[PDB]
Design a protein around this ligand. Structure first.
Ligand SMILES: *[C@@H]1O[C@H](CO)[C@@H](O[C@@H]2O[C@H](CO)[C@@H](O[C@@H]3O[C@H](CO)[C@@H](O)[C@H](O[C@H]4O[C@H](CO[C@H]5O[C@H](CO)[C@@H](O)[C@H](O)[C@@H]5O)[C@@H](O)[C@H](O)[C@@H]4O[C@H]4O[C@H](CO)[C@@H](O)[C@H](O)[C@@H]4O[C@H]4O[C@H](CO)[C@@H](O)[C@H](O)[C@@H]4O)[C@@H]3O)[C@H](O)[C@H]2NC(C)=O)[C@H](O)[C@H]1NC(C)=O
Ligand SMILES: [Ca+2]
Ligand code: NA
Ligand SMILES: [Zn+2]
Length: 388
């Protein structure tokens, strides 16, 4: 199979060019490839991890909606961001959406989000959990604009991603080519499944937990787009291309500068917006990630190197600790509990080798030793525990 796409790690069409990629699946994470479910091989954007199509009506049917058919699985369709209208490149759009979602399935699998932990696949090949729950991936979905969304039922019923067209530019911009938005939405599936176990999908339903829900997706999007030349001085926005706005869609850029991004845990007080709260959480995670990269180095290839189940580089280690924390934290967690789950994930993974790097990141932004959740007036702390 060949996919003509912006490769994994390019956040949007401004960061690079499309190329032909052969057989881009991980054979271990996608043992039937992306284009089979173990029963049928599909000459289109359908297989064990997802089914992608256009959805002009914006309704709920998907099985018979349009998707490009190629009997030799050569998915090479035209696209330029200068093209208009979006319907003219729906085939390229569907293929990009399918590619990004399946690449993310494979990375997440490597990080431990597998059939038995509640992932999204049609045929689980007897590896535990409930199947029949690949992701339904709708491109150019007619139910809205200037956004995207993800619906996560309990394990065994499909996730559903709706990608919209953005109308803040002429020509319109198709959100399926902003990998960061795809990754953000898919991460809602990950966090809702892992939190409180795969049978409970209502475990991020409070305002603070819903806030982390938004932040985890912004974080994973930001981690995936990091480039080899980046240092912690790099700032990253969210959705800047699709929204046609250099500030992106959050209040401040993700930055390790407390001037560029002054957010702290106290900024959650009185905040009624999960996207705002999620900006605080993702900013804390950006801090954590760079502490770990500065300590361990960066891997900016599409697969971590794992020694004894531990990523050797800091970027993948950060992603691993964040995903592990999701499975350890209580249902409807607060930031303190989520922090503690990441610390506990590191205890389990490395015997606490990264304790101080984790505490420093969180303490920098008011979630240090002695911080306490309160619905209305949180207790902040910049303190570190003994030894850090
Ligand atoms: C999966 O499936 C899809 C199919 O759905 C595949 O995609 C299709 O890919 C092909 C390319 O292989 C596309 O065809 C190209 O279409 C464009 C227009 O859109 C044409 O310019 C191009 O025309 C050239 O090739 C054809 C066919 O060549 C085959 O058969 C010949 C004998 O019949 C054979 O000799 C040749 O080597 C091929 O096996 C040919 O008939 C044309 O004359 C033309 O070839 C000449 O020109 C090219 C330069 O463009 C030269 O490289 C080539 O050698 C020829 O050169 C001679 O003639 C020149 C004068 O014309 C002269 O200057 C030279 O000196 C020389 O004498 C193709 O028709 C097709 O459109 C794609 N898809 C679609 C939507 O149709 C995909 O590849 C496949 N993938 C996999 C992994 O299997
Ligand atoms: Ca499942
Ligand atoms: Na599987
Ligand atoms: Zn979201």
């Amino acid at each position: 199979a060949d996919y003509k796409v912006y490769p994994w790690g390019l956040n949007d069409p401004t960061e690079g060019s499309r190329v032909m990629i052969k057989d881009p699946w991980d054979t271990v994470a996608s043992e039937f490839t992306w284009n089979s479910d173990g029963t049928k091989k599909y000459p289109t954007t359908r297989g064990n991890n997802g089914i992608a199509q256009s959805n002009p009506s914006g309704e709920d049917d998907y099985i018979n909606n349009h998707r490009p058919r190629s009997s030799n699985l050569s998915f090479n369709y035209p696209y330029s961001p200068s093209s208009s209208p979006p319907s003219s490149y729906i085939d390229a759009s569907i293929v990009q959406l399918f590619y990004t979602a399946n690449m993310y399935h494979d990375l997440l699998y490597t990080l431990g989000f597998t059939e038995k932990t509640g992932n999204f696949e049609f045929n689980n090949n007897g590896q535990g959990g409930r199947g029949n729950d690949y992701v339904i991936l709708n491109s150019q979905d007619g139910s809205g604009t200037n956004n995207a969304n993800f619906a996560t039922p309990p394990d065994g019923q499909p996730g559903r991603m709706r990608m919209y067209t953005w109308t803040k530019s002429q020509p319109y911009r198709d959100g399926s080519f902003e990998a960061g938005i795809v990754i953000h939405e898919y991460t809602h599936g990950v966090s809702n499944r892992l939190t409180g176990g795969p049978a409970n999908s209502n475990c991020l339903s409070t305002i603070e937990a819903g806030g982390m829900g938004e932040g985890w997706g912004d974080f994973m999007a930001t981690a995936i787009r990091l480039k080899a030349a980046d240092t912690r001085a790099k700032d990253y926005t969210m959705g800047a291309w699709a929204a046609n706005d250099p500030k992106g869609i959050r209040e401040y850029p993700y930055s390790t500068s407390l001037t560029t991004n002054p957010l702290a845990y106290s900024n959650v007080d009185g905040d009624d917006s999960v996207h705002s709260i999620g900006t605080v959480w993702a900013t804390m995670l950006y801090e954590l990630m760079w502490n770990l990269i500065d300590k361990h180095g960066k891997n900016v290839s599409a697969k971590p190197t794992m020694k004894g189940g531990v990523p050797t580089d800091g970027k993948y280690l950060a992603m691993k600790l964040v995903v592990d924390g999701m499975a350890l934290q209580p249902c409807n967690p607060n930031f303190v509990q989520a922090r503690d789950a990441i610390l506990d994930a590191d205890k389990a993974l490395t015997k606490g080798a990264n304790r101080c790097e984790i505490w420093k990141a969180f303490a920098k932004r008011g979630l240090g030793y002695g911080a306490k959740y309160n619905e209305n007036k949180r207790v902040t702390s910049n303190k570190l525990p003994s030894g850090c």
